[model samples]
Target: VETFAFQAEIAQLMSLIINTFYSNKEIFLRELISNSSDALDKIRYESLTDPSKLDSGKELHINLIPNKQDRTLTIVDTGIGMTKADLINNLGTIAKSGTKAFMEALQAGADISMIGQFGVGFYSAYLVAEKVTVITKHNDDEQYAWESSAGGSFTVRTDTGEPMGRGTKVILHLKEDQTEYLEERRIKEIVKKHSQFIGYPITLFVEK
Candidate 1:
């Protein structure tokens, strides 16, 4: 029902991965958590300048919630959130990343693929997600929802309910074959292994 439009090059890149590179489905969670680390880094970078920037009531953390009833996995973070323009530039385009130089450095024969190198890897959610919904509230803007199927285009809408101050939540509609990721232990292990040093607490709320 919800959709998003991506930049031309991004569309090609996503289409290629969705249809090809997902031989190992576990990478879905990997990409999401990596993005969260990046989000955390954004806040940390800002805090150095303002120190009081992210005076959020809660400690910095990432939460993963998997819904069995709906076959969805949601990754939530109280990190630096995105503005509407950010959503457009981030989700609506291709190869446009905040860490361009770092990515370039890795791409330059540095085997940086092990690092979170690609800006478009987020769309790799399509490797497992039937649909992806992003709910975010920025420090400077009102809350909004960005929905996508990674098929080509996406839609953004304003939220009319309670506000979610300075955070992001990504909901992934999982594919049938990759439902194992919904397990809490699996999610936690992946987080601990790959994202623990992201410099934020990682919480996993999986069904028992």
Candidate 2:
């Protein structure tokens, strides 16, 4: 894994979120799912105007899988994925607003609304997860994986896997104190409370 140190400013922002937000940690799920919904909205809107940007047959949805065996919870979405530049630009620095440009693009004929305003929502995962891994595939760029422990550095590299078609997968390795998130009922309750009215389907894959 190739490590990339976060910008000083980026590190500070992450530290603040991690330290100040743990009391309201369940919102991490809401933030993540909201980000997924925004991505799906963007892709769906783009396909209406430019069909070549995404596969027409693919469905737009979010899948949540909680694995007790691995102590990991995964959120996967069929949405507009990110390139290497997108990953670095969005996650590597705190100097820019990642969603503002997308909001601008939405105004230019694409009928879409995004829930991610500040773009800091992605970092909320650290509230519950000690380490997070993101595997994404974009139509414009090859698949890549981004991993971080929120220890001031992260690693990004090309990932070897069957193509995700066009989407992103986030896997959160829960911290010991945050293991309550691994329960199906707890996850269902959180999604119902925070993301029940989201624009797309958010399915939770839980143990029966």
Candidate 3:
């Protein structure tokens, strides 16, 4: 397993982003859903150039698995999943510092209101989750699980379970007060609120 921490700017951005949306914790779902949609688009685009890049007959879709008993909500996307290094560079640290534009924007005292426009959508998970686990696989690499609590660091390791051919599954271990996200009706509401125009349907598996 590997461990890495966020830069001070990232840490502050985490607090800023979370503090701004704390009153509307459900926005966290929107952020995740948006990310899944983006992932689906990523894979679809890659498929256009190289037919084989796209899994043959592998349709693009997203899935939400809400395990109420486990108090975890899993968001799965059949998209361009991340590789080991991708997980480390994206979640663990900004390996290419010059490209981490969010810090640049914040460092310049860019308007806080525009923070949502940044690609740090992942940080929104901290708004409701005590722990967020990401299981993913890229077409060219093995599956990996990257988890964090928005604390000093996060860990990445092999995902032993049968990993999806190529996709991502994000499991949100919700904070006790964030249980509303587990409700089917609540998820539907948020989907309708922010993601009504996506190309693929989102399949939700909630405890019935």
Candidate 4:
């Protein structure tokens, strides 16, 4: 397992954001779906001109699977998945020196309007999850699993699950106090309000 530590600034920011930044906890769903759409757009746009990077047989879509028994919420997307390096760099680092400004915005309640700008909205999963597992496959690399407990460190390893073909899957282990995220009805409402018009189809698989 290759482990990386979050920068000091990033650790501080994550703690604040996960605990206080988002007024509505459910909005993490929207930010995640939006990030998936952006990933889908990247490959789709590439396929338009290159016509070689994307598989024509693959259909771009998103899947939301809620497991009440396990108290987990899984969001899968058929988009541009990240490689091992991409996972380390993208998920490990804060990307830029905007941490101070971003934190200030959050404190002033101005961060909602600029959700995806700093590329850290993905961390919102930490808001309701005690741990997160990201299984992804990219065209340039083999499938890998990224796991973290929303702490200072994260681990990446080779994934042994069924092949993802091309995309990413994020599994959130719900916190004891955040079990509402595991409710299918609540998830549907969140999707409808935040991502009804997303370019890709968002399918929900809920336990009956």
Candidate 5:
């Protein structure tokens, strides 16, 4: 945990949702898949005017790789990916979740909560993950890992193994009781239900 300080309310909100308000736990998968879809959409739109965006194989897709032995579930998206600054800014600090008004609405027991707005949905990884690591490579940048534990803060480092030509790879180290997410059948059901309208295709890799 090479830690930094989270904008105060992010800590409060992430803590609030992960430990307490996980009534719809399956939304973690949906949130990630939808985010990946957004990435894919961005890259495709970019390629329309600048074709170099497709130089890293030109295949737009999403892959779910689950390792039962490691208790890790990885979501890889062949999208525009991110630069180093993006890694720090997007994952390190959440701008929208910083306001007192939004947080006050949630605390009041009112239904004015926006669960998937801004970057707050990313914290849903804590619903099942003890640790979350993101390895990403953009067409214009080198590879890096943006890592975080469930509670707070995150670190961006370069020892992200092999070079991924271009994509965002999110690995979730599932909590002991959350091993059900490691199952192909369960993941399939969740994907089918939550991501039916998503624009790209998705595949899952698991060893029997």
Candidate 6:
């Protein structure tokens, strides 16, 4: 089992990014859902050549479920899922201070301005979540589960039993202060504003 370790400067940079998202924490949904749409596009693009990988019959979709009891919010997408290798590589590795464009935008107080910018995008999820659980099923590989506290190292294991078809499900164990994000009006507005351009249908299960 390979464990993860970041360079000390990388660690320090992550701390700074997390601490400095004074306004855009809620943009995580926008980023995550947009990512799902991108994954679906990737698979669809590949399927043009390899039809066998397109067997999952579901339309591309993004769903959000909020659990008041557990203080959790889950996001699901019927897009391309990450395999074990992807989980290790994508979910691991953080470049420190080198992505100057990302840093420059944020430090300029225009951070959330380029929601379309490429690098360090996934790290935006930390703007809201305290703990994250990623469960994914890739058509090319078995299901896997990855958990992380963003405290440095993450743990990944072959998930149990059945797969979730061809897609990804991400659950956020919300921190106490972030619970307001579960509100129906709030989430809907954010989705419509930032994620309306997402290529898939976005759904939410919210309480009255």
Q: Among all windows of ten consecutive residues in candidate 5, which has the lowest summed lDDT? A: 110-119
**Per-residue lDDT over 1-208 for candidate 6, one digit per residue giving the tens place of the 0 to 100 score:** 3456544544444566567646767778877777788788887787788877778744677889988888888888888788887877644343344444556665677655363474455566667778888899988788888877766667788889566888889888887889977888888988888887776678898665
lDDT (CA) per prediction? 0.73, 0.79, 0.78, 0.81, 0.80, 0.73
> Of 4 and 6, which scores higher on TM-score?
4
Better of 3 and 6 by lDDT: 3
Best prediction by TM-score: 4
lDDT tens digits, residues 1-208, model 1?
3345676656665565567543656666777777877887888788888877776534577888999889999999888888988887744443555234434554475432333465545766777887888999877887898887777787888877567777899999888887887887787777666665666777777576
Model 5, TM vs. native: 0.89
The parts of candidate 3 lying over 4 Å away from their true place are 16-21, 90-115
Task: Write down the TM-score of every candidate.
Answer: 0.81, 0.84, 0.85, 0.90, 0.89, 0.84
Q: How many clashes (backbone atoms < 3 Å, residues ≥3 apart in a chain or on different chains) does model 4 have?
A: 0
lDDT of 2 by residue, 144-183 (tens): 9999888799889999976788899999999888889989
- Give lDDT: candidate 6, residue 4: 62
TM-score of 2: 0.84
Off by over 4 Å in 6: 6-10, 90-101, 104-116
Top candidate (lDDT)? 4
Residue 97 accuracy (lDDT) in model 5? 43
Candidate 6: lDDT of 171?
88
lDDT score of model 4? Answer: 0.81
lDDT of 4 at 153: 81
- Using lDDT, rank the candidates from best to worst: 4, 5, 2, 3, 6, 1
Candidate 3 residue-wise lDDT, 118-142, digit = tens:
7666777887888888989998888
